[PDB]
Amino acid sequence: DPNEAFGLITKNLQEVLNPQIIKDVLEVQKRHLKLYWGTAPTGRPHCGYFVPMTKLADFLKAGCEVTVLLADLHAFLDNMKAPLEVVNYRAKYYELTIKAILRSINVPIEKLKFVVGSSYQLTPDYTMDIFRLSNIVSQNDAKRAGADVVKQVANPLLSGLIYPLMQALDEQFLDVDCQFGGVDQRKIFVLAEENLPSLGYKKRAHLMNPMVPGLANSKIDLLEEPKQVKKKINSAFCSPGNVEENGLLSFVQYVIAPIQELKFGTNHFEFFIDRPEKFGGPITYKSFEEMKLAFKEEKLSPPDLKIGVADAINELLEPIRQEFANNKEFQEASEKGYP
Amino acid sequence: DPNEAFGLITKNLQEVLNPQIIKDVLEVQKRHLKLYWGTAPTGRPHCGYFVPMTKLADFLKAGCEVTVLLADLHAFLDNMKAPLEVVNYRAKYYELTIKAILRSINVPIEKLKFVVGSSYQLTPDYTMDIFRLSNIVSQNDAKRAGADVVKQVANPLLSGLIYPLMQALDEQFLDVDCQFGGVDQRKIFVLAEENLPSLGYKKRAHLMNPMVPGLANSKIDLLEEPKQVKKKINSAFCSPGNVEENGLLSFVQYVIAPIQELKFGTNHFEFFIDRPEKFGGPITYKSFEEMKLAFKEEKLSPPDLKIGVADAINELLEPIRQEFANNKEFQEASEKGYP
RNA sequence: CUCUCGGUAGCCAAGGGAAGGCGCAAGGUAAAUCUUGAGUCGGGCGUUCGACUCGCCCCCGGGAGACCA
RNA sequence: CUCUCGGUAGCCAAGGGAAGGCGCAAGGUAAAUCUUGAGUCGGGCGUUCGACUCGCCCCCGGGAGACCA
Ligand SMILES: Nc1ncnc2c1ncn2[C@@H]1O[C@H](COP(=O)(O)NC(=O)[C@@H](N)Cc2ccc(O)cc2)[C@@H](O)[C@H]1O
Ligand SMILES: Nc1ncnc2c1ncn2[C@@H]1O[C@H](COP(=O)(O)NC(=O)[C@@H](N)Cc2ccc(O)cc2)[C@@H](O)[C@H]1O
Ligand SMILES: [Mg+2]
Ligand SMILES: [Mg+2]
Numbered sequence: 015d016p017n018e019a020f021g022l023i024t025k026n027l028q029e030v031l032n033p034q035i036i037k038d039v040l041e042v043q044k045r046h047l048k049l050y051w052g053t054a055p056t057g058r059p060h061c062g063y064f065v066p067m068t069k070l071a072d073f074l075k076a077g078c079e080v081t082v083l084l085a086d087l088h089a090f091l092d093n094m095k096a097p098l099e100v101v102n103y104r105a106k107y108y109e110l111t112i113k114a115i116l117r118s119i120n121v122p123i124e125k126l127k128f129v130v131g132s133s134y135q136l137t138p139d140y141t142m143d144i145f146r147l148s149n150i151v152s153q154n155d156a157k158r159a160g161a162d163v164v165k166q167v168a169n170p171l172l173s174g175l176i177y178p179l180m181q182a183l184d185e186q187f188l189d190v191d192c193q194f195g196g197v198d199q200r201k202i203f204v205l206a207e208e209n210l211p212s213l214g215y216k217k218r219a220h221l222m223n224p225m226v227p228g229l230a231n232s233k234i235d236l237l238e239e240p241k242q243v244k245k246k247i248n249s250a251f252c253s254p255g256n257v258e259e260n261g262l263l264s265f266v267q268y269v270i271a272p273i274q275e276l277k278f279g280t281n282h283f284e285f286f287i288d289r290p291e292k293f294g295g296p297i298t299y300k301s302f303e304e305m306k307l308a309f310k311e312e313k314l315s316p317p318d319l320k321i322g323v324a325d326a327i328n329e330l331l332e333p334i335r336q337e338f339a340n341n342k343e344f345q346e347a348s349e350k351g352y353p
Numbered sequence: 354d355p356n357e358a359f360g361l362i363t364k365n366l367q368e369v370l371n372p373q374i375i376k377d378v379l380e381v382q383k384r385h386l387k388l389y390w391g392t393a394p395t396g397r398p399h400c401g402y403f404v405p406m407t408k409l410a411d412f413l414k415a416g417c418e419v420t421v422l423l424a425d426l427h428a429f430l431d432n433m434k435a436p437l438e439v440v441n442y443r444a445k446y447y448e449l450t451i452k453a454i455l456r457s458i459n460v461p462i463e464k465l466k467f468v469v470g471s472s473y474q475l476t477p478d479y480t481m482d483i484f485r486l487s488n489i490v491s492q493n494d495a496k497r498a499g500a501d502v503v504k505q506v507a508n509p510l511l512s513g514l515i516y517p518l519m520q521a522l523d524e525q526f527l528d529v530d531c532q533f534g535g536v537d538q539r540k541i542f543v544l545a546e547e548n549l550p551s552l553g554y555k556k557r558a559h560l561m562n563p564m565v566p567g568l569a570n571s572k573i574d575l576l577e578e579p580k581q582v583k584k585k586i587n588s589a590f591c592s593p594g595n596v597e598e599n600g601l602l603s604f605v606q607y608v609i610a611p612i613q614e615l616k617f618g619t620n621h622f623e624f625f626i627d628r629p630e631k632f633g634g635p636i637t638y639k640s641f642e643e644m645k646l647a648f649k650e651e652k653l654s655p656p657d658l659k660i661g662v663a664d665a666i667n668e669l670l671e672p673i674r675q676e677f678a679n680n681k682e683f684q685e686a687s688e689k690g691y692p
Numbered sequence: 693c694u695c696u697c698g699g700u701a702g703c704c705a706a707g708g709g710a711a712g713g714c715g716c717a718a719g720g721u722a723a724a725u726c727u728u729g730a731g732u733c734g735g736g737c738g739u740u741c742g743a744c745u746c747g748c749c750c751c752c753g754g755g756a757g758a759c760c761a
Numbered sequence: 762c763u764c765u766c767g768g769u770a771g772c773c774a775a776g777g778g779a780a781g782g783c784g785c786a787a788g789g790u791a792a793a794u795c796u797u798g799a800g801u802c803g804g805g806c807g808u809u810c811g812a813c814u815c816g817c818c819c820c821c822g823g824g825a826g827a828c829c830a
Contacts, residue, residue: 028828031762087484094488136477144480145426148511149433153492154824156511162829169754172487172495172518175511197828204762204827220762225828230723252722293720317721367759370693493755501760508823536759543693543758559693564759569792591791632789656790 103351287322442690
């Protein structure tokens with residue numbers, strides 16, 4: 015149903031650009047929306063990745079044609095974050111990490127498409143379109159567009175300017191109506207909207223998830239050891255009463271709640287905190303806002319919040335950790351992709 | 354003979370970078386030198402092009418494997434100087450112009466190879482190497498390298514930065530020992546020398562011809578009408594005695610002399626000037642330096658120099674003009690490439 | 693290619709017998725004030741009793757220059 | 762996408778009844794001094810007696826902004 019589908023597609027997002035495009039596809043064209051989410055097989059994925067994964071689940075639930083682009087070439091072009099022979103293994107590592115997360119939160123992944131960027135990004139039609147776009151995008155616009163995505167270094171490389179053009183062309187070459195990513199992709203997303211019509215290609219809608227802030231070593235690896243989860247959580251900034259600058263609270267806000275909501279309805283939020291009897295007994299918060307207000311009113315202390323978040327993160331990571339220990343290909347990709 | 358060959362290859366050049374490479378090819382490897390000259394099918398070629406053409410003749414005479422690269426894609430990437438469908442016709446126009454010049458100065462062109470840049474520049478191996486080089490060349494270096502070749506505009510396009518990288522890779526993909534161009538190519542040439550070894554490819558030698566200065570509408574089209582040649586020559590700067598800033602003198606220096614030398618030996622320079630009896634009779638200068646000294650000593654006036662240069666340019670252009678009027682494909686390429 | 697400035701703890705660095713500043717970890721959660729502790733000279737070959745320092749060759753990075761403008 | 766500044770002779774531009782500056786062409790070769798001549802408002806729809814000027818919609822370019830920094 016085109017209204018229900020639209021509701022599922024846009025829920026929990028910070029920003030939707032060109033919703034009319036999605037609405038036209040669902041209501042006028044009367045077909046399933048084609049979208050993709052792209053990731054550069056760069057460093058090891060962290061707990062921040064849970065946010066896009068919940069959205070992928072919403073998309074599949076809505077009947078969308080969902081593709082994950084393993085942007086291997088992009089990983090090379092971003093300041094050589096992934097080099098030459100290592101990127102292929104990283105692409106696999108990413109593929110299996112993504113599949114483990116989604117399976118860990120009970121999402122059926124049969125209809126999820128995986129495309130490796132180099133499988134079309136080295137064809138003549140694509141190269142020609144790089145040239146065409148490079149003729150339309152200023153040096154200053156390509157630099158600005160990639161500013162919050164491409165690593166900014168003292169002596170910037172030409173690769174950094176090609177990166178955002180290629181991300182825009184991918185929309186066309188993947189044949190989608192829509193691209194999904196974090197709000198940190200906005201500048202590239204807007205570049206795509208402004209420039210693809212100049213090439214003869216249609217404008218695409220854009221879906222953006224909120225970013226889960228750092229904790230400050232300020233992210234948690236998706237295969238982090240329980241004791242390392244303990245340490246990273248402990249060192250996180252946490253002022254009594256401060257809810258505005260609270261990485262742990264925001265983690266619960268943007269990761270725990272949506273994963274729990276993936277049971278169903280905005281009516282399942284149960285956060286257990288194993289509080290020591292000395293400072294009151296254990297407590298289970300039944301809504302996020304209640305948990306938020308508990309902290310602001312200084313009823314929930316920072317150390318108590320740390321206990322609850324570490325236990326919940328450890329809960330989430332367990333099945334991903336277990337899939338890693340059971341899968342040798344996953345283990346091989348880890349070893350060869352990160353020497 | 355490796356010494357004679359080297360003499361022919363380097364004669365009349367302003368600068369030779371890495372002569373040891375050429376010497377190694379001719380003396381140690383004991384084979385013919387492989388080189389290329391590249392041109393972007395951009396505006397209509399002018400009388401400046403005579404200089405590279407005399408060098409091509411020297412190269413073929415030396416036994417070199419000579420390729421002219423019709424850099425169609427480059428013509429597009431230089432501020433869209435040649436667009437989309439027009440460039441193909443311009444490439445042909447350039448091919449036939451080049452062949453007419455060389456035939457007009459009695460150079461056998463059978464062994465001259467022509468390659469269209471797009472015939473390999475859109476292959477996956479090339480695209481991959483663009484990415485590799487873009488990872489090694491800074492944004493600042495790509496900008497500087499193309500500064501005197503790529504048109505500098507108020508709002509520079511990304512295409513301008515890709516241009517010089519592609520010119521460097523062409524050396525490898527054309528499988529040459531050496532690239533020939535004007536001294537205005539030096540910055541790109543040096544970029545190629547500094548960066549190709551990083552990719553695993555060998556350093557190439559570089560041959561650079563001097564530039565024939567402007568006359569100041571300050572260049573003469575290779576199909577310029579006699580009366581238009583008259584006008585452009587007349588308006589050229591020419592101070593009595595000034596040989597240091599004298600576009601016409603420099604034209605004789607770098608175009609007339611080498612074309613005449615293509616009879617043979619540095620011992621044929623005959624410049625006829627149809628001087629009106631009022632200011633002395635006609636005069637034929639037997640060496641350039643004598644003609645130069647005549648002007649410095651104020652024995653040869655600016656208007657007299659204008660007469661001689663216009664007649665000589667008209668002499669050179671005649672057979673090219675005649676080939677254009679006899680060749681319909683050449684005529685078609687002109688009409689469709691320059692609407 | 694030519695000139696020029698650089699390379700010293702993860703980062704910013706001062707300098708013929710290894711300063712600081714940032715970061716790191718310690719010291720009902722963390723941070724921030726504070727006071728303490730851990731953490732070697734791009735490479736080679738020389739000259740010297742002894743080289744981070746002096747001589748040479750090399751490797752890497754920045755800036756500029758490189759017909760004309 | 763949001764905000765903001767622009768679009769007027771080839772180029773730089775000042776501005777409810779088309780300034781300059783550069784360039785161009787003229788005025789024993791040319792240039793340079795000099796003095797003279799040629800050369801209409803991004804588009805549409807309105808409001809008005811009359812629009813370059815006022816109102817709206819559009820098209821094009823620059824700069825910035827766009828979670829956080
Ligand atoms: N902490 C976080 N919270 C929420 N989301 C996070 C967090 N970290 C990364 N993400 C989100 O997960 C996605 C993958 O991150 P990434 O860094 O691997 N990907 C990129 O930077 C993309 N530029 C890769 C890409 C390449 C080509 C394309 O056509 C499309 C995309 C990004 O869209 C990002 O917004
Ligand atoms: N007035 C002149 N005097 C002497 N030579 C002149 C003159 N004008 C152009 N030339 C010389 O003729 C050659 C062709 O000029 P062009 O402007 O068409 N070519 C370029 O700018 C080259 N960048 C085109 C190229 C592209 C890819 C390559 O792999 C190699 C080359 C250039 O090497 C130039 O030095
Ligand atoms: Mg990544
Ligand atoms: Mg050209």
